[PDB]
Design an enzyme around this catalytic site. Structure first.
Site, PDB file in Angstrom:
ATOM      1  CG  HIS A 170      -1.772   1.042   1.337  1.00 51.04           C
ATOM      2  ND1 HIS A 170      -1.259   2.220   1.756  1.00 51.04           N
ATOM      3  CD2 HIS A 170      -2.973   1.240   1.268  1.00 51.04           C
ATOM      4  CE1 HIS A 170      -2.227   3.222   1.644  1.00 51.04           C
ATOM      5  NE2 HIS A 170      -3.282   2.545   1.302  1.00 51.04           N
ATOM      6  CG  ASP A 183      -0.813   6.539   2.931  1.00 46.97           C
ATOM      7  OD1 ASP A 183      -0.054   7.378   2.249  1.00 46.97           O
ATOM      8  OD2 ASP A 183      -1.919   6.298   3.056  1.00 46.97           O
ATOM      9  CE  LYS A 184       1.533   0.759   7.911  1.00 47.44           C
ATOM     10  NZ  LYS A 184       2.600   1.425   8.700  1.00 47.44           N
ATOM     11  CD  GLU A 201       7.935  13.149   7.896  1.00 48.43           C
ATOM     12  OE1 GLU A 201       7.372  12.031   8.018  1.00 48.43           O
ATOM     13  OE2 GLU A 201       7.538  13.698   9.153  1.00 48.43           O
ATOM     14  CD  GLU A 216      13.351  18.148   9.101  1.00 46.94           C
ATOM     15  OE1 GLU A 216      12.883  17.332  10.118  1.00 46.94           O
ATOM     16  OE2 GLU A 216      12.651  18.422   8.046  1.00 46.94           O
ATOM     17  CE  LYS A 234      -7.277   1.150   2.069  1.00 47.48           C
ATOM     18  NZ  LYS A 234      -7.838   2.618   1.995  1.00 47.48           N
ATOM     19  CG  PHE A 267      -6.786  -2.890  -6.833  1.00 48.36           C
ATOM     20  CD1 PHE A 267      -5.869  -1.909  -7.231  1.00 48.36           C
ATOM     21  CD2 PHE A 267      -7.004  -3.154  -5.317  1.00 48.36           C
ATOM     22  CE1 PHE A 267      -5.015  -1.523  -6.174  1.00 48.36           C
ATOM     23  CE2 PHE A 267      -6.335  -2.813  -4.524  1.00 48.36           C
ATOM     24  CZ  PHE A 267      -5.382  -1.854  -4.814  1.00 48.36           C
ATOM     25  CG  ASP A 277      -3.724   6.668  -3.022  1.00 50.00           C
ATOM     26  OD1 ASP A 277      -4.185   7.781  -2.923  1.00 50.00           O
ATOM     27  OD2 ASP A 277      -3.695   6.082  -1.800  1.00 50.00           O
ATOM     28  CB  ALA A 278       0.152  10.338  -3.628  1.00 49.33           C
ATOM     29  NE  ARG A 338      -2.844  11.080   4.739  1.00 54.58           N
ATOM     30  CZ  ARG A 338      -3.157  11.420   3.500  1.00 54.58           C
ATOM     31  NH1 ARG A 338      -2.272  12.506   3.160  1.00 54.58           N
ATOM     32  NH2 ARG A 338      -4.026  11.206   2.811  1.00 54.58           N
ATOM     33  CE  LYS A 339      -3.837   3.726   4.951  1.00 51.21           C
ATOM     34  NZ  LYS A 339      -4.036   4.976   4.523  1.00 51.21           N
ATOM     35  CE  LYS A 398       7.526  11.508  13.527  1.00 53.57           C
ATOM     36  NZ  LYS A 398       6.268  11.974  14.471  1.00 53.57           N
ATOM     37  CE  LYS A 450      13.231  13.625  15.466  1.00 58.20           C
ATOM     38  NZ  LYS A 450      14.923  13.757  15.572  1.00 58.20           N
ATOM     39  CG  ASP A 457       4.700  12.489  17.641  1.00 56.23           C
ATOM     40  OD1 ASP A 457       4.052  12.871  18.225  1.00 56.23           O
ATOM     41  OD2 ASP A 457       5.054  13.028  16.569  1.00 56.23           O
TER      42      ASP A 457
HETATM   43  C1  LIG Z   1      10.197  19.791  16.965  1.00 59.94           C
HETATM   44  S1  LIG Z   1       9.712  19.811  15.348  1.00 59.94           S
HETATM   45  C2  LIG Z   1       9.721  18.098  14.909  1.00 59.94           C
HETATM   46  C3  LIG Z   1      11.006  17.445  14.980  1.00 59.94           C
HETATM   47  C4  LIG Z   1      11.957  17.594  14.209  1.00 59.94           C
HETATM   48  N1  LIG Z   1      11.572  17.162  12.654  1.00 59.94           N
HETATM   49  C5  LIG Z   1      13.408  17.573  14.210  1.00 59.94           C
HETATM   50  O1  LIG Z   1      14.226  17.385  13.157  1.00 59.94           O
HETATM   51  O2  LIG Z   1      13.599  17.116  15.598  1.00 59.94           O
HETATM   52  C6  LIG Z   1       7.919  19.775  14.994  1.00 59.94           C
HETATM   53  C7  LIG Z   1       7.251  21.141  15.095  1.00 59.94           C
HETATM   54  O3  LIG Z   1       7.635  21.699  16.297  1.00 59.94           O
HETATM   55  C8  LIG Z   1       7.676  23.158  15.893  1.00 59.94           C
HETATM   56  N2  LIG Z   1       9.206  23.477  16.149  1.00 59.94           N
HETATM   57  C9  LIG Z   1      10.079  23.490  15.270  1.00 59.94           C
HETATM   58  N3  LIG Z   1      11.323  24.184  15.665  1.00 59.94           N
HETATM   59  C10 LIG Z   1      11.118  24.337  17.120  1.00 59.94           C
HETATM   60  C11 LIG Z   1      11.763  24.975  18.040  1.00 59.94           C
HETATM   61  N4  LIG Z   1      13.051  25.120  17.895  1.00 59.94           N
HETATM   62  N5  LIG Z   1      11.143  25.135  19.211  1.00 59.94           N
HETATM   63  C12 LIG Z   1       9.923  24.691  19.314  1.00 59.94           C
HETATM   64  N6  LIG Z   1       9.203  24.294  18.529  1.00 59.94           N
HETATM   65  C13 LIG Z   1       9.846  24.014  17.344  1.00 59.94           C
HETATM   66  C14 LIG Z   1       7.281  23.250  14.502  1.00 59.94           C
HETATM   67  O4  LIG Z   1       5.914  23.665  14.408  1.00 59.94           O
HETATM   68  C15 LIG Z   1       7.442  21.920  13.994  1.00 59.94           C
HETATM   69  O5  LIG Z   1       6.614  21.666  12.826  1.00 59.94           O
HETATM   70  C1  LIG Z   2      -8.992   4.125  -3.529  1.00 53.85           C
HETATM   71  S1  LIG Z   2      -7.357   4.874  -3.468  1.00 53.85           S
HETATM   72  C2  LIG Z   2      -7.588   6.353  -2.816  1.00 53.85           C
HETATM   73  C3  LIG Z   2      -8.524   7.484  -3.611  1.00 53.85           C
HETATM   74  C4  LIG Z   2      -7.529   7.900  -4.907  1.00 53.85           C
HETATM   75  N1  LIG Z   2      -6.420   8.915  -4.396  1.00 53.85           N
HETATM   76  C5  LIG Z   2      -8.290   8.440  -5.871  1.00 53.85           C
HETATM   77  O1  LIG Z   2      -7.635   9.270  -6.897  1.00 53.85           O
HETATM   78  O2  LIG Z   2      -9.409   8.222  -6.080  1.00 53.85           O
HETATM   79  C6  LIG Z   2      -6.881   4.333  -1.769  1.00 53.85           C
HETATM   80  C7  LIG Z   2      -5.991   3.057  -1.596  1.00 53.85           C
HETATM   81  O3  LIG Z   2      -7.191   1.863  -2.237  1.00 53.85           O
HETATM   82  C8  LIG Z   2      -6.300   1.199  -3.051  1.00 53.85           C
HETATM   83  N2  LIG Z   2      -6.833   1.121  -4.272  1.00 53.85           N
HETATM   84  C9  LIG Z   2      -6.145   1.648  -5.349  1.00 53.85           C
HETATM   85  N3  LIG Z   2      -6.836   1.510  -6.573  1.00 53.85           N
HETATM   86  C10 LIG Z   2      -7.796   0.673  -6.175  1.00 53.85           C
HETATM   87  C11 LIG Z   2      -8.776  -0.066  -6.926  1.00 53.85           C
HETATM   88  N4  LIG Z   2      -9.071  -0.075  -8.174  1.00 53.85           N
HETATM   89  N5  LIG Z   2      -9.663  -0.858  -6.241  1.00 53.85           N
HETATM   90  C12 LIG Z   2      -9.687  -1.012  -4.690  1.00 53.85           C
HETATM   91  N6  LIG Z   2      -8.812  -0.550  -4.158  1.00 53.85           N
HETATM   92  C13 LIG Z   2      -7.787   0.425  -4.850  1.00 53.85           C
HETATM   93  C14 LIG Z   2      -5.050   1.400  -2.570  1.00 53.85           C
HETATM   94  O4  LIG Z   2      -4.531   0.592  -1.677  1.00 53.85           O
HETATM   95  C15 LIG Z   2      -4.923   2.738  -2.609  1.00 53.85           C
HETATM   96  O5  LIG Z   2      -3.839   3.183  -1.845  1.00 53.85           O
END
Ligand SMILES: C[S@@+](CC[C@H](N)C(=O)[O-])C[C@H]1O[C@@H](n2cnc3c(N)ncnc32)[C@H](O)[C@@H]1O
Ligand SMILES: C[S@@+](CC[C@H](N)C(=O)[O-])C[C@H]1O[C@@H](n2cnc3c(N)ncnc32)[C@H](O)[C@@H]1O
Ligand SMILES: COc1ccc(-c2nccc3[nH]nc(C4CC4)c23)cc1
Ligand SMILES: COc1ccc(-c2nccc3[nH]nc(C4CC4)c23)cc1
Lengths: 380, 380
Positions: free
Chosen positions: B14, B16-17, B42, B55, B166, B235, B243-244, B249-250, B270, B274, B276
């Site tokens: 998938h 996103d995965k 990311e 980063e 899915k 499919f 699909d991007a 996103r999961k 991460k 982090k 999270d």
């Molecule tokens: C802390 S950053 C996430 C971690 C980061 N990706 C890293 O490289 O460690 C997440 C969010 O915190 C906020 N952020 C960024 N720089 C920060 C800073 N110096 N102090 C506090 N919050 C910050 C921004 O809203 C950012 O999108």
């Molecule tokens: C249906 S697509 C999301 C909607 C899409 N971004 C669009 O342009 O309509 C989401 C997920 O469904 C699955 N998918 C993609 N094509 C499909 C299809 N023809 N039938 C069923 N599931 C599908 C894939 O896992 C995909 O990442």
């Protein structure tokens, strides 16, 4: 009987929120010309770059460069000194048509009311009577703190503020027969991007006096409230330069701040056939209708779908013990009053209207009397 | 007393995965050379493209082209006929150093045990006694259906299968003094990418006989169970072409399938600072320890942090009515037995070890006896 609960919010210039707003600016641009546009626009933001990736099938002619740059200008990133500038950033586009395999299974040669869900998935709606707008106080306060920062930045009161911000609010609640009653604010966090010249003490004093005191009622603040204001000590690098942003990475901020439940789907950049957005809006509408209708004080609704199938596969309601009616009775009331097929939700909630960029910051719920926030009068 | 609940899962291919697995392959590559690497990677995937954005500050020398392509090869995208090929796709890199403003506020010149949280946020842990692994049956079954598809694809049993899939499972439950008891499977959805030659009837028959019957115990399936197998009808286009995909996103598939609660943070790409990821793993560890320890049958734990601050700002426990102890008593037990500072969680859960790619498909919880799945013996 008391407990703590924490929620967070982010500002318009938080990099993930920039992406949600750009994705919805793209969706709105398409819907202005083609109400039936099929849109699935993801945005990525990093230093100097906005990338659009996804699938769009539409009769609209959209100038992505102009749409993206206008959204970034609105947010406030207009100079290299702020770390990002709409005038000079790179805008890259990797958009293709919607997969014909999805189109044939979802909407091609289908009556609009009988269009299939655009994907499978689960979605929840939630409402609580603890505020007039039927939202948790933790998330309402967290959003209002970010909105106040943007207001003071835009009016020139605190000219050292920049668009990227995050807030977090912990409230102590009392349990009340399944419902929840806010008692006091336990902790507030505020982090906001700032210019090179302002000192930490000036920022902390302003965040307490001009931001917190202007938003949070004094009755919730006491000698024990803990404040973490600019806790990192320095936040000059911010926006996409400080952290990569992606669409759909603030789904809990967009909804209930951790309350209720979430099925995982992101909202921004998607047209009505994507039930991740339309069915979550409809589930909020059902939940708020049950609370405003006096049937419950607090309620959670789950719905689920399969791609290509119009009717939900399942519907469930949990009232937390706040209703005299059973789940079976509430489900019957919902069946008699709502039709949760995507092709009917679009009509009830006017989901071809280009108002989506307005939903993409400060939460999708509890604001501005959008159609999903106007309760339906229930017949039973 | 009965209700329905639905959860979903997705396969390794998938889109996103794919991104979550690549982000964690990058994290593991850095940790193999530098256990203290600061990583926030990311990934974005669209037709023919893997983009890394984020980063990283690390002493490692990582070949991103090789790492990315090896992860895609493992997933199974190895030919243009499948819609994506690790050998010939574009790999773009937009990685910069970690912001020095974040570094100074979080970890620079800090004793490891006293490192600050890498960001603010809220996180939840959940455990339920309904399965031996303390996970909801809906999500366990949904993951196992995707794993079975990958197994039959890789062993050549169903050579028409492709990596993108899915699943979705709706279970009817009985309420039991706050705990939940699965009764039967109400609905199953399976959608999986396939080759051009196989017909719909052959796929639907195989999905029922070789996939569902091989995973779901017959005692849960009856004449009323609804099956939506290949509900879109076609499919062939799939993976990033259909699909991007984006990292994070999961997040509901990664956790509890909608049960418990979620604070919004993504896990993949991460390092331990982090919270999270590290604090969600620690909260799962606490929740599972409370259930395996016999203190509750079902429990939810919330923790929250501020950037730069080591100790959590708040800690809350909800036992759904399944414990004889109050929340105050359970919080005291947790305080005496756990230290939820990120610089202590790293030691308890061995979070500098490069095992993260193994977590990035089929859920982070309820599998493989990872450190957060081995309960702590509680003293009280
Ligand atoms: C802390 S950053 C996430 C971690 C980061 N990706 C890293 O490289 O460690 C997440 C969010 O915190 C906020 N952020 C960024 N720089 C920060 C800073 N110096 N102090 C506090 N919050 C910050 C921004 O809203 C950012 O999108
Ligand atoms: C249906 S697509 C999301 C909607 C899409 N971004 C669009 O342009 O309509 C989401 C997920 O469904 C699955 N998918 C993609 N094509 C499909 C299809 N023809 N039938 C069923 N599931 C599908 C894939 O896992 C995909 O990442
Ligand atoms: C997902 O929505 C929720 C919301 C609230 C509660 C809850 N109700 C009563 C007492 C409690 N103590 N701690 C908690 C939660 C924070 C862990 C809690 C549970 C779930
Ligand atoms: C976030 O975790 C949950 C999990 C389960 C329930 C719940 N418990 C009892 C009866 C119920 N009927 N419907 C529901 C839910 C599906 C709407 C429900 C509530 C919340």
């Amino acid at each position: 009987g008391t407990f703590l609960f924490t929620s967070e919010s982010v500002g318009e210039g938080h990099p993930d929120k920039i992406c949600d707003q750009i994705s919805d600016a793209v969706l709105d641009a398409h819907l202005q010309q083609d109400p039936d546009a099929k849109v699935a626009c993801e945005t990525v933001a990093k230093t100097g770059m906005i990338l659009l990736a996804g699938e769009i099938t539409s009769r609209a002619a959209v100038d992505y460069q102009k749409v993206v740059r206008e959204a970034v200008k609105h947010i406030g990133y207009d100079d290299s000194s702020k770390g990002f500038d709409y005038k000079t950033c790179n805008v890259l586009v990797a958009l293709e048509q919607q997969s014909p395999d999805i189109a044939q299974g979802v909407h091609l040669d289908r009556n609009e009311e009988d269009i299939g869900a655009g994907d499978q998935g689960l979605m929840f709606g939630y409402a609580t009577d603890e505020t007039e707008e039927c939202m948790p106080l933790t998330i309402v306060l967290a959003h209002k703190l970010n909105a106040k920062l943007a207001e003071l930045r835009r009016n020139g009161t605190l000219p050292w503020l920049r668009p990227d911000s995050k807030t977090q609010v912990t409230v102590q609640y009392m349990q009340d027969r399944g419902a929840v009653l806010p008692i006091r604010v336990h902790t507030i966090v505020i982090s906001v991007q700032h210019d090179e010249e302002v000192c930490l003490d000036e920022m902390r004093d302003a965040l307490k006096e001009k931001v917190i005191k202007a938003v949070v009622p004094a009755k919730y603040l006491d000698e024990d409230t803990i404040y973490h204001l600019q806790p990192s000590g320095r936040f000059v690098i911010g926006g996409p330069q400080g952290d990569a942003g992606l669409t759909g990475r603030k789904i809990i901020v967009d909804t209930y701040g951790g309350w209720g439940a979430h099925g995982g789907g992101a909202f921004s950049g998607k047209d009505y056939t994507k039930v991740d957005r339309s069915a979550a809006y409809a589930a909020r509408w059902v939940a708020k209708s049950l609370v405003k209708g006096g049937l419950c004080r607090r309620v959670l609704v789950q719905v689920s779908y399969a791609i290509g199938v119009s009717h939900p596969l399942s519907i469930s309601i949990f009232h937390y013990g706040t209703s005299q009616k059973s789940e079976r009775e509430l489900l019957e009331i919902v069946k008699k009053n709502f039709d949760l097929r995507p092709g009917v939700i679009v009509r009830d909630l006017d989901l071809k209207k280009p108002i989506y960029q307005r939903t993409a910051a400060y939460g999708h719920f509890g604001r501005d009397s959008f159609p999903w926030e106007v309760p339906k009068k229930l017949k039973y």
